[PDB]
Design a protein around this ligand. Sequence first.
Ligand SMILES: Cc1ncc(C[n+]2csc(CCOP(=O)(O)OP(=O)(O)O)c2C)c(N)n1
Ligand SMILES: Cc1ncc(C[n+]2csc(CCOP(=O)(O)OP(=O)(O)O)c2C)c(N)n1
Ligand SMILES: [Mg+2]
Ligand SMILES: [Mg+2]
Ligand code: NA
Lengths: 802, 802
Amino acid sequence: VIGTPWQKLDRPVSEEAIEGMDKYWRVTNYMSIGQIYLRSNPLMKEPFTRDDVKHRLVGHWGTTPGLNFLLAHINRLIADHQQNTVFIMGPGHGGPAGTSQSYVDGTYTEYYPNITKDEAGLQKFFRQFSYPGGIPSHFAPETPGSIHEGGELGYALSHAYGAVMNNPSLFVPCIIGDGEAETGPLATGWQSNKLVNPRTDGIVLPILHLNGYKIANPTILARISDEELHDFFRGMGYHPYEFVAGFDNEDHMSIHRRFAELFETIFDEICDIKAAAQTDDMTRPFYPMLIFRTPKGWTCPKFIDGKKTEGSWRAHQVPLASARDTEEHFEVLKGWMESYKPEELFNADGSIKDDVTAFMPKGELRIGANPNANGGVIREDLKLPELDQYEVTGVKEYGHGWGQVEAPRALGAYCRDIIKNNPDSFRIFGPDETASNRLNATYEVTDKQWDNGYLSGLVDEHMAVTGQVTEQLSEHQCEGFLEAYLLTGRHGIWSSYESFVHVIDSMLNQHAKWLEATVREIPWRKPISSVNLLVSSHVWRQDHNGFSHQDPGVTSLLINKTFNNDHVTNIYFATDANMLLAISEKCFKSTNKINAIFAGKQPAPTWVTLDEARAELEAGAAEWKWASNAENNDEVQVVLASAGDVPTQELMAASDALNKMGIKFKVVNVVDLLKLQSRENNDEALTDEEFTELFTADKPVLFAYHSYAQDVRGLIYDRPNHDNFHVVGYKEQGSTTTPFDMVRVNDMDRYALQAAALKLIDADKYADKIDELNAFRKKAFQFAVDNGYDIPEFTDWVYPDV
Amino acid sequence: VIGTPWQKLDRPVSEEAIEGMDKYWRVTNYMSIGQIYLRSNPLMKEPFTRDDVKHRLVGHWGTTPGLNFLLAHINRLIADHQQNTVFIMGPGHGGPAGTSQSYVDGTYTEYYPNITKDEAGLQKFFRQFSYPGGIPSHFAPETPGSIHEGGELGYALSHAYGAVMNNPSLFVPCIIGDGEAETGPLATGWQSNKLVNPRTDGIVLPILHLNGYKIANPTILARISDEELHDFFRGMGYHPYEFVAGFDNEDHMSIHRRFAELFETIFDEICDIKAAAQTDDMTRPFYPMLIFRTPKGWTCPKFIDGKKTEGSWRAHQVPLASARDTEEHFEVLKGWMESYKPEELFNADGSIKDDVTAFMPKGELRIGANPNANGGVIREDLKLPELDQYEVTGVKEYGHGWGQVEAPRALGAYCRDIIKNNPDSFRIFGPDETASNRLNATYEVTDKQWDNGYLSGLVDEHMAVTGQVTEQLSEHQCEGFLEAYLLTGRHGIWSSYESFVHVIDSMLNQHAKWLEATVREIPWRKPISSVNLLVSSHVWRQDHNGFSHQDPGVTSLLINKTFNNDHVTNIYFATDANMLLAISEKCFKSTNKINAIFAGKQPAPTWVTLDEARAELEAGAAEWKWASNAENNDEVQVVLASAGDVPTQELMAASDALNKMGIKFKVVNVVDLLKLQSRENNDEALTDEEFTELFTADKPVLFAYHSYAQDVRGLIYDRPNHDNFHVVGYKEQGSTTTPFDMVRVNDMDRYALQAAALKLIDADKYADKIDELNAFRKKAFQFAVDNGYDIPEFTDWVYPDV
Ligand SMILES: Cc1ncc(C[n+]2csc(CCOP(=O)(O)OP(=O)(O)O)c2C)c(N)n1
Ligand SMILES: Cc1ncc(C[n+]2csc(CCOP(=O)(O)OP(=O)(O)O)c2C)c(N)n1
Ligand SMILES: [Mg+2]
Ligand SMILES: [Mg+2]
Ligand code: NA
């Protein structure tokens, strides 16, 4: 247990804590200006001149003094209440407030010992910000206290609410840009309070950083009427509180005492909710939220060159951009930095004075030290059930190609038992598609968590106020809740229709960037559990939905996060349920990855046994020798290779026909796609030797790919024999139609694959046969048009091993 | 002018209009069930049996009777008020309601003459729905009345509000799923009423289709308290009205008269707002919105096999899934279809009776006929200013490589004059980045439109209640507002930081799917203006922001919409301002495309004159003969090729050094990326002959690519000489650092490009020189680390032609 959660003070905030927070706000504003502007002379010691100013002024002042004021007060709250706390910096461009926080709390020098608490360390700390060889301008993963960089805005609320799930002792003050609140993902993030339980989850306090402006415009929420702004928050289930300061001549000590009093009223309401939830965990409370309305750039010069800067969008990035180049801007910078009175905040040796930090929390309650902001320190491996009990044993009993299993059901049973063994640390998220993607075996041991109105057992099923599955129709919510659930040390999986994974392409990009920077250079940030995404209800079988639902291209996005032997991204094609089991175990043991797990939810054959899946998964691609009919590679006339459930079923039927014609081939199944890349691009890929053993040195290779052929063409560009591959993939053809027609129109059906194999072997010899196969594809299409189902010769085919 | 806009009735709705709407609702519910369930016998004529039921039951009933009821009432409104109207079907899976609407209004048989108004046409209409060789299950572009398919949910509101911009006569009732309202893009779409003006724009009426459920869960908005739901809408600037029906035994005629009365009160409020805005166009009104709370699946069987189906998520997809297979489900289907009393709705010949449609609008006011739902019928070409006045004439006057122009400023001036010449039909959208991306020359002739609070001329600049630029910090809003502005017949452009274009990858996928289906098979849907996106503030120069802002990969997404010689997608690399001008003119003349226009906003050289840009753009890739030093292709030792402003600047400096060494090369610039694909993949690409003329038949090619190398490797896989290309691209390296360091760490700097050229020519001979160049890259990096700016030898370089 960290601290003493949800305790009220029952005395006023002390005057010493008020004095300490004003000194914090002054020193963190002074050091944030020093990080943006100074390359030397951090204490302005004689002579202080333009030569001490950076030659490239980069970074963002406007948000920063607001964040520094909130951080003084959240620090005071943590210390006085001993409250386990992680904050979220929505305006992540306020990086200097997050680095200043960790430098004051002492974690900065603990994690970066060269950056010491004295004049030399402070000089290094100022220069390194947003500087070559230095550190980022945002609240990046290399800053203690960060689980959210806030560069791509929108995800502050889903991260906050995912951090509190199953974390009943944790408070998260979530600071949200008022410009960020104009994004789609932030606007739906406020609704998450219908999806957490005040007994079994922790508490988010949204703090809208309503400083009036974004980069070059006012914000929508700051300029609507105050009545509308409070109705809006009350309508989303909050009790809004509003604080306004800095627009008049109120002295800063008075401002701190009024804010401390308000924050204590808010925290007491949060403690009342937490106490009441011990008894009534079914009534959803109106959780507090705070509208914090202060001038953008607060405390900077009111006008610069005749233009209003404090209280304007003009304060967003770098005011005084000529500070190194003109004596006029320099004297303004000098007066601005002097206004914080640093001679009162630092000792002669350059260390921040004890009276500046006496009010701060200590130990693991410090924002920079709390293990929830470095969740791999808390993470334990999952207690996994043995995988063999889930195996589809039909392949062993009856043969390769057996049955009509819906593959994700085996993963549903495996996840049900992972939840039973890990009942508060593994969650499932889905955008109203957990049952549609066939993971509903999980409801045998838990419920979908819904903290909103119930009506009747005739409609509400598998649903309760606490539970380990969460659904909302928003891929941004599912991906963001899971990312923070992992960042805080826990585990989970989500599923999405494949075409709609694209809604969250950019969130995958950012969490991959967070992993890239972590595995490269932040070894104190310990490994977290991977993002596991079941990508299902895929392009080949959108029977009720059609063309808008046909887009497997998240493969191509994921390929753009495969560099530097970081190994943070995996793309897996589950050939059947036993392959899906073997991939899922590997994913659930893995850390520091995004694992995209492709699997079809339609009834489909099972190709391999579980032991076979385990071996083939490790290599990444495998010959299926029981399907190949060639003696050796030299007798091969064509290599039949596939990745994906439906391309594999059509390739296997093509193999059956080609065997019956007397054609010699081998069959290669591909599961771990990036293992096709060269070793020069991927030091864990097949070697050239192993790749040539599979694909041959010089025989044609027909490759039936689940996604866009471009992916495979690009990945194998420097591989031996790559000129001999013919990659057939989805090609933006399809609608609501029958299973055969959907593969027919992308030349992926068994008949077109058999024709393409013959064209690669001898197009002249097999010209008539290729025409007969193309005519059969037309007869089977007319059959579907006339009859309303596919030709039995297509539907009824079973691999002959069965 | 269409109809008589914004007119009140000042009499009650007639009883004949009530009788007509109930007959519409019955016939459209009956035909929607017929589209999902029947392959023959649409009038249930003796014998009606299981053999008339489809063998594959696909499609979605639950939303559909709600939409059919709203469409009866919107049709009655249009006819009685003569109101120019386009609706939006947010729950686009209710396709059978949109096809039934067009079949009743008569547009279906006008556009599809085989689908006649009689028993044979009705049989064909039932069978073809969601059927092989037939039509989609959603409200696809091939349905008259659609500008929004609604397959990927979320975009109903941004499309509605973009359709009304500069369309002051147009009413848009926007029907929004209550599950769809849980998405990010829909949640921020409600805020668009701060961005339209009630005098100069038209009026959206949001209608929340609050049927209680999504696929397998209740919805957040249906289960929060009613007080919260109305506070929420009032807080977002609406006057909420709520209608509840179908949960008790109220007869349907009574329901229609109560709804007609409410819809008239709402429409009168909208007419009051429109009249008042003629005089006061600065006070933002509280626009009506309608909460429409009815049971999901309304009018279907209350229980099926003991499970509650009407008023449940169970009604979402296909109830009675055994209708063909068991006599029990069949008799339920038979009784359900009989309950609409089709013998009263159709004549003996199968035509819908006159008394069913006498209340409907006629002519171009019909939902299926209105030209705003087929905007290419209204679209006129833009009146474009002559391009030569914008040319950067420095290349002609002083030489190739001249100056420090910020390229988008030339496009800003060109757009300013396009707005002046087309003052109500060309808009700019940006997510608070129009000025940051250097398009603010537009504010010389218009303002950013902001219909929300003003405070002071010291902060509000270039901003007014009417104007032709729109900014909100949401890429979903900008892309959705523009898509509908184009779909309704107008023109425009938006700009985004490159990394964040990814937020709307999935919207690009869907608008490309809408274009694919239109150019393939819907020739009555006339060409619309293209989506033009300036992709700027790119990966090489995110000086204030860093690694989260470094992701040029929308190239790779766009490559997955390049099939079938549809030619709906273009990827352009603007080498400099004159190239950007030539690309922008081509884009602004183009139709039926998505044009992604890559350009850097940093000060940069200008390489080509405007006439040169015009020629080179047409071919797609061009030799720069003034930069090449080789006699002919056979004397070339390496081809130096680049795509993108910064790769081109570094390649040109590498060319200068290589010339000075005595190395023979040629320089090829690539602007129209997909023109590198083979003709077999793209019938408008360079031919093999033209491609070999540029890249040689067998010399090494060093290709400095702006984005991820994978893209170029995949596109050239079947091109002559492709094995000799070495593609250098971004590789997930970088942070907030200097311009040289950012290209250094991706091996893109001039020194690494010169080294790679030497390694391709003779790695043994030039081993020492390659070491010297790699050491210089380390000295220039240490220089930046020590001094805080790049080495003058790097920054001060100018191509020697200048
Ligand atoms: C998704 C996304 N779109 C665009 C941007 C570009 N951008 C960086 S800061 C910023 C304005 C942020 O304004 P606000 O949230 O109000 O922050 P503050 O005023 O506290 O600086 C924008 C538009 C972004 N970072 N993320
Ligand atoms: C962005 C997105 N995510 C997921 C889906 C999958 N899906 C199709 S319908 C649907 C439920 C829609 O519920 P609602 O909007 O309430 O529509 P209605 O109840 O009127 O059928 C979902 C989850 C989708 N179509 N779009
Ligand atoms: Mg702001
Ligand atoms: Mg619904
Ligand atoms: Na090759």
